[PDB]
Design a protein around this ligand. Structure first.
Ligand SMILES: Nc1ccc2cc(S(=O)(=O)Nc3ccc4cc(S(=O)(=O)O)cc(O)c4c3)cc(O)c2c1
Ligand SMILES: Nc1ccc2cc(S(=O)(=O)O)cc(O)c2c1
Lengths: 726, 394, 396
């Protein structure tokens, strides 16, 4: 009937001291972390039932954990399998979970959360059910509700209680909408945590001491949350309040402004559950939250985002592409060649990780201006207060700018960021390859030049490897590791471990012109340029890019990548295949590139492109663009433009998997999202195929029909490869 | 079957928003004064034939809540058998009350009906009733809620209306409203508002600025709604914001009454029919741009009555925004001398619930003055709707 | 009076109770959208562009029910943007008034197909949320002699001489006839169960009913600011008001919505729709606003004079069970037979969703006329402020 329960193993340990304080120690024996699994639901149901039974002999409850992490989310393995027909079970599961927490909450006696480590998602939802939260200010301790980042929403009372605690606007912006994780100090600052302790050993004693003092100082209000008292007033007011009702119609429009119209239903569902929940009582609000939760879990976007940002991202971090058996080799001195934006950013993220960096350029003045990129970055970090002056000085002190090739003495890790000329890169490596250590990694930050050709410029080709970064290096989280033919597996592992060391996500790519990121992002740019040549309005092309979910619209990106760079990229791919006796595959976007080069509008670096630029600031599209390409003469559906750019990247990704360029779909999904900004709601350019949804249906079969639908209308380049076909 | 005739059409002066003369007057008192004026003009009227009172009100809360129509029937001492119903179709609530009244008379089940609206925006501001399109995030995200002002600026951008274009129209409305007042056109219809002691409170449209100059309008000044509008209208790069407080409709208080009945009802009461409701129509357009509803509604009511633009002597569109009227004039190729000939809401104001009934009576008088035959009245509506009515002078 | 108005569909939601009701978590906009999607399921090939207006009754158009909830329903349900959408308020008869206006719009010839109905989520937007001049303005409250409906209902029982056992005997019959109707499956194809965004069931029955009601239980209930003095100042010949009305013999506070599809013969024939009933006549009248609830009797006589009919010509009488004495007075005035009056129960058992009531009891009579294979039915409601509305339908 209406129970605390939904074979499994016990997860909670029971302990009632002489004062009547029961200590519920969550300790899942089937893993290293407490997770809202079927074992927890049964274990918490047993403990809560015993709390109701022994209520006459219990004076307080303390919820603690025996793991290094308090409690980190739920069984994502289970929620990703929830089909639309399983919405009833999903609803009953979260209703049972919140029924247990609601009983623990309304127990008539204080309950304190002893947060020892990370309390994330469902874990923070357990602490929020308690009346008092004490956190241990320790390393790596995080608190937050990152449900939205998996296409879900806080369904275990997270949305209902954070709204009751901070109001609609504060709870949405600060905690719910972006799933922000907080350190224990910041968690106490915003109200998520009530007080802090230095070590984990003081937690449980302080929790029982607070219960001892709360019963003595507040006998009436003990074990009663603020929203359960008489005369509770929600901060900021309810939607019926005259103040909130004036600004409330601007919340969904602002959210659509942030999402840029991208089909992400999770933030919208959070704002709906937050507002609709504030209009009714707590229990009814909680049931509304359950229905929106079951709506997302059974939806396809959540399955895409759960696949990418939970399973795929863990499979990468677990060394899925790291060679087996290879051990760890420390990195003592990093030598960066070139002090451009790339080389300076490389030198920053390396020194930020604690490495000693020797930033070499042609001149001491150039190498000094490169270190200034880290100084102006530490300036903003010290201004907004993200780091201390103590460690900001130690960070810059690890960067040693130089112009002498002898200062690469003792370097066991070389990253090159000079301009992309083959003979140039061969000269730069030749004058340092004998100064550095004999086991030094020789890395290149090329974006198109094949690694096997660059490897001939050194004698230790087995240690030559491609280390492709993305600007700005201080913010872009992906590193494309390219494996040449001679690149050993040890060099692959050391660069793999280096990428994780600087706090970035690696993908391993076999050598091929264009690699994976540059090759796939070309199809995205080329589809837009095609559409412009076909006569589509330039504003519609940019809108189609933003509404697809991309961070930057394509024509705007086509100005940062420079059309002269795009021109010689197409000339190089043509010349290479032509020398092999074949017939190059020309793309219709090439005609639009050459037309813009002729008009003297080659991109942002020139100062004029598809947009007009003033004092280095973009200021609207070029008015002569419409007359040049007869804009308005072709008016296809916006969803066709959106699908033309998404499918182009999705089909090119499938080619890279067929050609062995990628070795795992996890590298393709994370590599597309974090490398070239593929929309996160898709779950990646590889997940988009199996997770496609439209009028043709859902799944790989619908993607194929829609690909053939686009192929008939816009060209056979949208024909699905043989692997996708049954 | 039956034919609907307008026997009377009066209205109150429109009191401005800031320091308005009608701010102290309850909206119920505005309607009761117009009811007493109808008794003054026809003391022989057997009010037992008045079968319903249909009032339009956009914010039916507070002073305007609890079926203000029924309150007006009881408070004014009308027979208890005279019904009383409040409706709401946003800006065209006044004209919808008239249309419904005419439709009830045509149905043969109603003999004599009072219709009109009331809106005391200084006491009950717009949006006070709440709403699901705005306050519910699940549906605000779906219907792409955008304020009417942005949809008006979007129209000016798409149609190529400059800042001088919308301001030149705003100057025209100010001049034609002053010309109509100084010409005594509004003498019979504008019923001055008085207190319980008979002392004068307001006898003119306070929102009018007849000393407006083109230079003064150019010195006027125009939360993510622009991005929401451009997400649907993806071919337009940027919205040119041209509308200011001088080229948009004013926020004013007021009320209007229209006595509609069958021929038999008017003959039995000795009433002289002034105009005949020829046809009405309700249509709509995209709710993001919102204010493009009048064009299909006007087109629909013209085909229903078997009439064309050439057969209409006077066009009366509510001047919610200057671009909405210029867009309407551009679409149907309306002559300049036929469009809002006595000024509009830009000069005199826009009392939401009562505007449809105000411009309706404004055309009844102007049809009799010019001795013209037909007039078409239409309004743009929030949510993308549109209402149009064709009257013929009898 | 040219075009004939026909009822093609008449559906409603189950009526969820006020205290811990199943529908308290459902927004009233969602209740209306649910009925729109049901009409789409029953007629998938219906060209919705023919639908020219959506008229919804709503007595408290505030909060969730403000901002033209009909237009919100048109936009949210994805109906054609040219389908209008207007909210009207005529107190308790707003639901029937929307149907009457929809039928009158069809008769005028300027509208072809109209959705009419009402919605009232009283557990979310309680009565009086809109304020009101007759109540909250002292100059008007003093003049109109404002008295709540319940006191006027007690006054009717005092004047006509209905005892506490009289009003409770009717309440028992309403609970019994409503339970018999549900058990017989009379409401099977008309009550559309409410579901959430996941398809999970929320409510599929009128949960305000108490089918185990007894005469003994009703007699134990207690009856429900000087309003008694105000009513007797006008009815000066009455000494003291006998308060006989309790929560058992009065209408219930419930949430719910109803939808009726009304159109011309050309509109239904073009869409392949089968007309279920025809609007014969409507009428609006009223009586004293202090007793308030004597409005149905003149409105019923007026609609019978307009259609050229008498009491004997009507097969089923359906009056909203606002209060038991109101129905007993209406039965006493016109000599209504017992076996013709509220044969499937009424608001005492199933509830009174203010904006949706008129459209609900209308759809009840369209179904009962077909089941009994009868011809005519007369639907009427008492209204606050002393008004009345009646309508006569005929099975086609
Ligand atoms: N000791 C630790 C403990 C946890 C660590 C997690 C990450 S992670 O952010 O990469 N993984 C994620 C990703 C999504 C999550 C969603 C939810 S949910 O509840 O919203 O479903 C809950 C989670 O815990 C999630 C964790 C990184 C670490 O270093 C960690 C270290
Ligand atoms: N014009 C109509 C319409 C409906 C009718 C129904 C019946 S019945 O309910 O006895 O079957 C009898 C009639 O004569 C009817 C005549």
């Amino acid at each position: 009937g209406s129970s605390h329960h939904h074979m499994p193993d016990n997860t909670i340990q029971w302990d009632k001291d002489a004062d009547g304080i029961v200590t519920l120690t969550m300790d899942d024996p089937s893993g290293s972390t407490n997770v809202m699994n079927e074992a927890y639901i049964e274990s918490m149901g047993k403990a809560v039932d015993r709390l109701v039974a022994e209520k006459d002999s219990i004076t307080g409850v303390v919820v603690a954990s025996a793991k290094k992490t308090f409690f980190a989310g739920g069984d994502v393995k289970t929620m990703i399998q929830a089909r639309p027909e399983d919405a009833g079970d999903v609803f009953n599961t979260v209703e049972t979970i919140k029924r247990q927490l609601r009983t623990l909450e309304t127990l008539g006696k204080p309950v304190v959360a002893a947060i020892n480590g990370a309390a994330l998602g469902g874990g923070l939802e357990i602490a929020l059910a308690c009346h008092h939260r004490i956190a241990a200010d320790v390393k790596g301790s995080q608190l937050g509700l990152p449900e939205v980042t998996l296409g879900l929403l806080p369904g275990g009372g997270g949305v209902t209680r954070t709204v009751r605690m901070f109001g609609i606007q504060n709870a949405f912006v600060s905690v719910l909408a972006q799933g922000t994780r907080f350190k224990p100090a910041k968690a106490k600052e915003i109200g998520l945590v009530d007080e802090l302790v230095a070590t984990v050993e003081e937690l449980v004693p302080a929790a029982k001491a607070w219960i001892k003092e709360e019963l003595k100082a507040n006998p009436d209000g003990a074990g009663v949350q603020p929203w359960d008292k008489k005369g509770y007033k929600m901060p900021g007011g309810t939607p019926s309040s005259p103040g909130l009702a004036a600004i409330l119609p601007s919340f969904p429009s602002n959210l659509r402004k942030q999402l840029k119209g991208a089909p992400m239903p999770a933030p919208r569902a959070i704002l709906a559950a937050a507002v609709e929940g504030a209009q009714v009582d707590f229990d009814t609000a909680s049931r509304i939250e359950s229905r929106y939760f079951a709506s997302l879990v059974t939806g396809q976007v959540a399955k895409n985002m759960m696949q990418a940002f939970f399973f795929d991202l863990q499979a990468i971090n677990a060394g899925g592409s790291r060679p087996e058996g290879i051990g760890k080799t420390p990195i003592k001195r990093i030598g960066v060649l070139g002090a451009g934006m790339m080389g300076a950013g490389i030198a920053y993220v390396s020194a930020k990780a604690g490495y000693e960096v020797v930033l070499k350029d042609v001149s001491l003045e150039a190498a000094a201006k490169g270190k200034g990129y880290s100084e102006k970055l530490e300036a903003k970090a010290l201004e907004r207060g993200r780091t201390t002056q103590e460690r900001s000085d130690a960070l810059l002190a690890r960067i040693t700018p130089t112009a002498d090739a002898a200062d690469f003495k003792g370097v066991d890790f070389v990253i090159e960021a000079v301009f992309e000329n083959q003979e140039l890169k061969h000269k730069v490596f030749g004058e340092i390859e004998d100064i550095v250590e004999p086991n030094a990694i020789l890395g290149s930050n090329t974006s198109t030049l094949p690694i096997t050709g660059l490897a001939t410029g050194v004698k230790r080709q087995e240690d030559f490897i491609g280390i492709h970064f993305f600007s700005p290096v201080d913010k872009m989280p992906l590193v494309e590791i390219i494996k040449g033919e001679k690149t050993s597996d040890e060099a692959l592992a050391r660069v793999f471990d280096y990428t994780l060391a600087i706090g970035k996500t690696p993908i391993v790519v076999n050598d091929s012109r264009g690699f994976f990121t540059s090759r796939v992002i070309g199809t995205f740019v080329n589809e837009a340029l095609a559409m412009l040549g076909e006569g589509v309005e330039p504003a519609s092309i940019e809108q189609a890019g933003s509404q697809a979910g991309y961070p930057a619209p394509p024509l705007q990106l086509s100005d940062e990548l420079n059309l002269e760079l795009m021109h010689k990229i197409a000339v190089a791919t043509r010349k290479g295949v032509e020398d092999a006796g074949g017939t190059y595959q020309p793309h219709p976007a090439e005609a639009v590139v050459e037309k813009m080069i002729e008009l003297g509008r080659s991109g942002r670096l020139k100062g004029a492109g598809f947009y007009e630029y003033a004092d280095g600031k973009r200021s609207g599209l070029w008015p002569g663009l419409r007359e040049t390409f007869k804009s308005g003469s072709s008016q296809p559906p916006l969803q066709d433009m959106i699908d033309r750019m998404l499918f182009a990247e999705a089909l090119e990704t499938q080619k890279c998997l067929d050609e062995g360029v990628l070795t795992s779909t996890a590298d393709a999904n994370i590599g597309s999202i974090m490398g070239i900004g593929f929309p996160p709601w898709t779950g990646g350019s590889a997940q988009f195929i199996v997770g496609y949804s439209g009028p043709a249906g859902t799944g790989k079969a619908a993607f194929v029909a829609r690909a053939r639908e686009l192929a008939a209308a816009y060209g056979d380049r949208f024909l699905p490869p043989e692997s996708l076909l049954s | 079957s039956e034919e609907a005739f307008i026997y009377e059409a009066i209205r109150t002066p429109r009191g401005k928003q800031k320091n308005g003369s009608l701010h102290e007057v309850k909206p119920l008192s505005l309607v009761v004064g117009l009811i007493d004026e109808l008794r003054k003009r026809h003391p022989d009227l057997d009010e037992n034939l008045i079968s319903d009172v249909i009032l339009g009100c956009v914010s039916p809360v507070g002073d305007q809540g609890g079926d203000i129509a029924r309150a007006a029937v009881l408070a004014s001492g009308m027979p208890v058998t005279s019904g009383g119903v409040q409706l709401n179709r946003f800006c065209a609530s006044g004209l919808e009350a008239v249309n419904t009244a005419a439709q009830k008379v045509r149905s043969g089940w109603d003999d004599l009906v009072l219709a009109g609206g009331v809106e005391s925006m200084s006491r009950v501001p717009m949006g006070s009733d709440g709403g699901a399109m705005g306050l519910d995030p699940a549906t605000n995200y779906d219907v792409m809620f955008v304020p009417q002002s942005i949809g008006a600026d979007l129209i000016a951008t798409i149609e190529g209306f400059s800042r001088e274009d919308v301001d030149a129209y705003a100057l025209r409305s100010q001049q034609k409203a002053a010309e109509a007042w100084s010409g005594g056109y509004f003498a019979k219809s504008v019923v001055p508002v008085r207190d319980q002691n008979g002392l004068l409170i307001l006898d003119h449209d306070e929102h009018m600025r007849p000393d407006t100059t083109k230079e003064g309008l150019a010195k006027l000044k125009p939360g993510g709604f622009d991005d929401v509008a451009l997400q649907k209208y993806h071919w337009v790069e940027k919205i040119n914001h041209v509308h200011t407080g001088g080229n948009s409709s004013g926020i004013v208080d007021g009320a209007a009454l229209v006595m509609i009945g069958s021929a038999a009802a008017g003959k039995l009461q000795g009433l002289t029919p002034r105009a005949r409701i020829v046809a009405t129509a309700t249509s709509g357009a995209d709710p993001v741009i919102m204010l493009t509803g009048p064009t299909p509604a006007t087109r629909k009511v013209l085909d229903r009555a078997g009439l064309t633009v050439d057969d209409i002597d006077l066009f009366e569109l509510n001047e919610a925004f200057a671009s909405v009227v210029l867009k309407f004039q551009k679409d149907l190729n309306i002559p300049d001398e036929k469009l809002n000939v006595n000024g509009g809401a830009i000069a005199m104001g826009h009392p939401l619930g009562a505007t449809g009934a105000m411009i309706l009576g404004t055309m009844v008088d102007e049809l009799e003055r010019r001795n013209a035959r037909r007039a078409l009245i239409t309004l743009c509506i929030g949510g993308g709707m549109g209402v149009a009515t064709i009257i013929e002078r009898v």
